[PDB]
């Protein structure tokens, strides 16, 4: 099937995501509305249920509101049954309208709909070529107090109606009981509770298996993507075994939320995007885009530096989900802010690298502060706003122009207020020019592009005051004045003769899994896929066509491989690196080491004989291990994804700067479980 197909659940760069708070979009079925204290039909108390549901989204796909805008994927609230309690927090009543307070991950939230309503939403979305992404929040169940078991539903977890347990009297340790986080360390934020939310214990085998069975059920119902809540707050080794469960079963595009503030660049955030098996909401993009287009706290050089820097720091930049606002920030459009600012920031996001997400109601110029005020019901379904038309004109280019979906980003002209950038993929080109200054025109002289000679018409049709671009010989444009607030997009597409890989999904899986390689120029006849120097041909290539190849991962040793395609004529593609072949299915094992005393800046790590443990390489060792909450120094601990059902060999080490101190003695051995978790508890061998 081609790369742009709705059946491509693995890669979303050709898509535009519309993020819906299900309760706040459309009430298509009033019979499923919560009653009494839990419901507010006027939606003026934004902490209560207003009535929006899966039938309302079906109705808006059907009548052309969503499809008219060019949307090709929707991201909805977590679908699972939530608690029914109305919680009073300091006067204000609060309900689970947002879908984040789960009680049963195997059932639906009936305010949103039934299992049949969910099936009908999947089938309507697919019939209209829209992919469906669901939130999934495996970190916690709901607000709970173990001291007061009558508060809310005491964080209770059920498995298809069957009670597994609550927070009070948790004799099975389904939950963490360490108090609440103060967010001081990443360790602190993982094992302590977020606010009053009952923290699930993923080291408990019943919790691990339950959540893995639950995600497979939603994959069996046809979902096409997953957005994981609070990835900063769950053990990264458990989330890698969770991603291996998805990828080795039915791989679908998965991304998480790790919040970053203005000007925060975090190593851990970039490591997580690069090594977890999921991508991230691109807060680095979003925060700089709001500084340049909204708050004017940075200029075009800051935007350029973010695009140039992120291209390097994210191993797969085409998988990162970009946005200009969402449920965790003030709405981009403000009361006293010019609407052209929103329109430009949307045109920039839709033409930039990554997978663009638009927060519902952006096209209706909704304004509002932070939660709950950024989640008002959307006030209108007018299809004639400039913002609606901006998305309607640009969002189809992700499907039709491979340069927009996959290309490189090249700054061609810049000054403090103007950027002109080019996206390029093979011979496909798009050029975007943005003047954020609203009172001064920009004189553009000396613009060179990769466009062939011609008079290119602005894809926006002059609605954001764009103009035609005349390109002569050598891609040189004739000079022009870009209007105050001007935004224009120019493009050229052709068929590629060289194979070029634009995206690969999934990025981590065991031998025998089919991955999806998307791009252009592969040709019609089956050629060769290289995983390192290993060639895969014939029957192992499950499908081959010019924009997409599906191929089985060869039985190569676990490790990181470069992927390369050669078409039937032997012409080879660019290399798409950082593919992780797993040793096999994964389980999370907690490694605990006692009596590992360290100096200042010296930390304990783990390594061993499988790729999952760094293959005995100190530079790739697992850690630094943790040593504050579940166990305290000099005992260190860490939850690590490792191959299931096999005897691994390992050793601990201390590292400080360039010095590695290994444990002495014989190498340690451990036979991992086939599913569930296990704990290894040992003592430092000098």
Ligand X SMILES: OC[C@H]1NC[C@H](O)[C@@H](O)[C@@H]1O
Query: Which residue is catalytic, options 117, 187, 229, 422?
Result: 229
33 belongs to an annotated ligand binding site: yes
Question: Among Ca ion, its own copies, ligand X, none, what does residue 555 contact (CB within 5–8 Å per kind)?
Answer: none
Looking only at the bridges linking them, the beta strands covering 73-76 and 17-19 are parallel
**DSSP element (H, E) containing 406:** helix 402-406
Q: Helices 205-220 and 236-249, interaxial angle, to 10°?
A: 40
Of 103-142, binders to ligand X (CB under 6 A) are 137
Size of the site for Ca ion (CB under 5 A): 9
Residue 589 · residue 680 · CB < 8 Å: yes
Which CB, 305 or 555, lies closer to its own copies?
305
Binding residue for its own copies, selected from 163, 305, 463, 543, defined by CB under 8 A: 305
Query: Is residue 2 involved in binding its own copies (CB under 8 A)?
Result: no
Which CB, 260 or 414, lies closer to its own copies?
414
Question: Among Ca ion, ligand X, its own copies, none, what does residue 667 contact (CB within 5–8 Å per kind)?
Answer: ligand X
Peptide bond between residue 263 and the one before it cis (omega within 30 degrees of 0):
no
Which CB, 120 or 685, lies closer to ligand X?
685
Contact mark string toward ligand X, 183..222, x via CB under 6 A:
-----------x----------------------------
> 3-state SS string over 452-475?
CCEEECCCCCCCCCCCCEEECHHH
Of 550-569, binders to its own copies (CB under 8 A) are 562, 569
Of 69, 175, 120, residue with least CA distance to 392: 69
Query: Is residue 230 involved in binding ligand X (CB under 6 A)?
Result: yes
227 belongs to an annotated ligand binding site: yes
d(CA 138, CA 290): 30
Residue 211 · residue 684 · CB < 8 Å: no
From the list 130-138, 204-212, 474-482, 589-597, the region that binds its own copies by CB under 8 A is: 474-482
620 belongs to an annotated ligand binding site: no
Query: Is residue 639 involved in binding Ca ion (CB under 5 A)?
Result: no
Query: Is residue 575 involved in binding its own copies (CB under 8 A)?
Result: yes
Whether residue 224 lies in the annotated active site? no
> What phi-psi label fits residue 155: left (phi over 0), alpha (psi between -120 and 50 degrees) or beta?
left
Q: How far is CA 547 from CA 191, 321, 402, in A?
A: 44, 22, 10
- 434: tokens are 């943005």
196 belongs to an annotated ligand binding site: yes
Q: How far is CA 489 from CA 184, 281, 351, 482, 606, in A?
A: 45, 25, 8, 12, 51
Question: Among Ca ion, ligand X, its own copies, none, what does residue 662 contact (CB within 5–8 Å per kind)?
Answer: ligand X
Query: Is residue 23 involved in binding ligand X (CB under 6 A)?
Result: no
d(CA 227, CA 323): 14
Under DSSP, the state recorded for 576 is E
Question: Among ligand X, its own copies, Ca ion, none, what does residue 446 contact (CB within 5–8 Å per kind)?
Answer: its own copies
CB-based burial label for 223 (10 Å; 0-12, 13-18, 19+): buried
Contact mark string toward ligand X, 632..671, x via CB under 6 A:
-------------------x----------x----x----
Of 45, 35, 34, 149, residue with least CA distance to 99: 34
Query: Which residue is catalytic, options 40, 153, 257, 325?
Result: 257
684 belongs to an annotated ligand binding site: no
Task: State in angstroms the smallest separation of the CB of 10 from its own copies.
Answer: 26
Which CB, 380 or 534, lies closer to its own copies?
534
327 belongs to an annotated ligand binding site: yes
Which CB, 137 or 551, lies closer to its own copies?
551
CB neighbour burial string for 434-449, b if at least 16 within 10 angstroms, e if fewer: bbbbeeebbebeebeb
Which CB, 70 or 426, lies closer to its own copies?
426
195 belongs to an annotated ligand binding site: yes
603 belongs to an annotated ligand binding site: no
d(CA 141, CA 95): 14
Binding residue for Ca ion, selected from 14, 94, 139, 550, defined by CB under 5 A: 139
- 246: tokens are 């998805």
Residue 513 · residue 471 · CB < 8 Å: no
> 3-state SS string over 292-353?
HHHHCCCCHHHHHHHHHHHHHHCCCHHHCEECCCCCCCCCCCCCCCCHHHHHHHHHHHHHCC
Residue 524 · residue 433 · CB < 8 Å: no
- 111: tokens are 């305010």
Binding residue for ligand X, selected from 3, 15, 104, 229, defined by CB under 6 A: 229
Binding residue for Ca ion, selected from 199, 319, 325, 585, defined by CB under 5 A: 199
Peptide bond between residue 90 and the one before it cis (omega within 30 degrees of 0):
no
Question: Among Ca ion, its own copies, ligand X, none, what does residue 51 contact (CB within 5–8 Å per kind)?
Answer: Ca ion
Question: Among Ca ion, ligand X, its own copies, none, what does residue 309 contact (CB within 5–8 Å per kind)?
Answer: its own copies
- Residue 386, classed as helix, strand or coil, is helix
401 belongs to an annotated ligand binding site: no
Query: Is residue 255 involved in binding its own copies (CB under 8 A)?
Result: no
Binding residue for ligand X, selected from 123, 311, 328, 373, defined by CB under 6 A: 328
Whether residue 23 lies in the annotated active site? no
The CA radius of gyration of the chain, in Å to the nearest whole number, is 26
From the list 15-23, 231-239, 302-310, 488-496, the region that binds its own copies by CB under 8 A is: 302-310
32 belongs to an annotated ligand binding site: yes
Query: Is residue 445 involved in binding its own copies (CB under 8 A)?
Result: yes
Query: Is residue 414 involved in binding its own copies (CB under 8 A)?
Result: yes
Query: Is residue 651 involved in binding Ca ion (CB under 5 A)?
Result: no
Half-sphere exposure of 564 (CA within 13 A, CB side): 14
Which CB, 214 or 345, lies closer to Ca ion?
214
208 belongs to an annotated ligand binding site: no
CB-based burial label for 33 (10 Å; 0-12, 13-18, 19+): middle
* Binding-site ranges for Ca ion (CB under 5 A): 27, 29, 32-33, 51, 53, 139, 199, 233
Which residues of this protein are in contact with ligand X, per CB under 6 A?
Answer: 100, 137, 194, 229-230, 257, 328, 616, 651, 662, 667
Known binding-site residues for substrate equal 100-101, 140, 193-196, 227, 232-233, 327, 371, 375
Residues that bind its own copies (CB under 8 A): 265, 298-302, 304-305, 308-309, 410-411, 413-416, 445-448, 474-476, 530, 533, 562, 569, 572, 575, 617
Cite the annotated binding site for Ca(2+) by residue number.
27, 29, 32-33, 51, 53, 139, 190, 199, 233
The catalytic residue positions are: 229, 257
């Amino acid at each position: 099937a081609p790369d742009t197909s709705v059946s491509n659940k693995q890669n979303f760069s050709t898509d535009v995501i519309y993020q819906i708070f299900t309760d706040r979009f459309s009430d298509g079925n009033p019979a499923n509305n919560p009653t009494g204290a839990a419901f507010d039909g006027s939606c003026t108390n934004l902490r209560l249920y207003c009535g929006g549901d899966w039938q309302g989204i079906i109705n808006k796909i059907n009548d052309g509101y969503l499809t008219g805008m060019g949307i090709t994927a929707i991201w909805i609230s977590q679908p699972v049954e939530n608690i029914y309690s109305v919680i009073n927090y300091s006067g204000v009543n609060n309900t689970a309208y947002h879908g984040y307070w789960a009680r049963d991950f195997k059932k639906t939230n009936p305010a949103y709909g039934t299992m049949q309503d969910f099936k009908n939403l999947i089938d309507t979305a697919h019939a209209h070529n829209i992919k469906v992404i669901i939130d999934f929040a495996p970190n916690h169940t709901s607000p709970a107090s173990s001291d007061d078991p009558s508060f809310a539903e005491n964080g209770r977890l059920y498995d298809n109606g069957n009670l597994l347990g609550g927070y009070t009297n948790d004799t099975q340790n389904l939950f963490h009981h360490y108090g609440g986080t103060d967010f001081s360390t990443i360790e602190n934020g993982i094992y302590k509770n977020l606010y009053d939310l009952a923290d699930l214990n993923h080291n408990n085998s019943s919790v691990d298996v339950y959540l893995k069975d639950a995600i497979k059920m939603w994959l069996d119902l046809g979902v096409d993507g997953i957005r994981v809540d609070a990835v900063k707050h769950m053990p990264f080794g458990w989330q890698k075994s969770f991603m291996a469960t998805i990828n080795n079963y039915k791989p679908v595009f998965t991304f998480g939320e790790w919040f970053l503030g203005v000007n925060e660049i975090s190593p851990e955030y970039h490591q997580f995007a690069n090594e977890s098996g999921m991508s991230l909401l691109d807060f680095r993009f979003a925060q700089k885009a709001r500084q340049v287009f909204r708050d004017n706290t940075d200029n075009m050089y800051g935007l350029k530096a973010m695009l140039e820097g992120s291209e390097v720091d994210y191993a797969q930049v085409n998988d990162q989900v970009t946005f200009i606002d969402n449920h965790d920030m003030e709405r981009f459009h403000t009361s006293n802010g010019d609407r052209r600012k929103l329109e430009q920031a949307l045109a920039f996001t839709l033409t930039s690298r990554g997978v663009p997400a638009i927060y519902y109601g952006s096209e209706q110029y909704m304004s509002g502060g932070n939660d709950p005020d950024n989640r008002a019901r959307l006030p209108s379904f007018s299809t004639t706003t400039t913002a609606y038309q901006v998305i309607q004109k640009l969002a189809p280019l992700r499907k039709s122009n491979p340069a927009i979906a996959y290309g490189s980003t090249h700054e061609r002209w810049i000054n403090n207020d103007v950027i002109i950038y080019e996206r390029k993929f093979g011979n496909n080109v798009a050029v975007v020019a943005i003047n954020r200054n609203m009172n001064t025109p920009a004189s553009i002289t000396g613009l060179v592009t990769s466009l062939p000679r011609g008079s290119y018409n602005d894809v926006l049709g002059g609605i954001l005051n764009g103009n035609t671009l005349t390109v002569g010989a050598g891609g040189a444009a004739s000079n022009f004045t870009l209007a105050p607030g001007g935004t224009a997009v120019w493009q050229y597409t052709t068929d590629a003769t060289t194979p070029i890989i634009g995206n690969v999904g999934p990025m981590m899986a065991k031998p025998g899994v089919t991955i999806t390689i998307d791009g252009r120029g592969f040709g019609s006849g089956k050629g060769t896929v290289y995983f390192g120097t290993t060639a895969v041909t014939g029957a192992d290539i499950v499908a081959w066509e010019d924009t997409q190849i599906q191929v089985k991962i060869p039985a190569v040793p676990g490790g990181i491989y470069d992927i390369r395609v050669a078409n039937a004529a032997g012409a080879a593609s660019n290399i798409y690196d950082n593919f992780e072949v797993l040793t096999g299915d994964q389980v999370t094992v907690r490694f605990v080491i006692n009596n590992a005393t360290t100096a200042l800046g010296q930390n304990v790590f783990l390594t061993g004989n499988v790729s999952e443990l760094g293959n005995w390489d100190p530079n790739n060792a697992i850690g630094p291990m943790y040593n504050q909450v579940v166990y305290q120094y000099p005992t260190w601990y860490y939850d690590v994804s490792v191959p299931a059902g096999q005897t691994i060999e390992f050793k601990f080490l201390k590292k400080q700067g360039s010095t590695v101190t290994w444990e002495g003695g014989a190498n340690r051995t451990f036979t991992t479980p086939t599913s569930g978790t296990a704990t290894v508890n040992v003592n430092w061998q000098p």
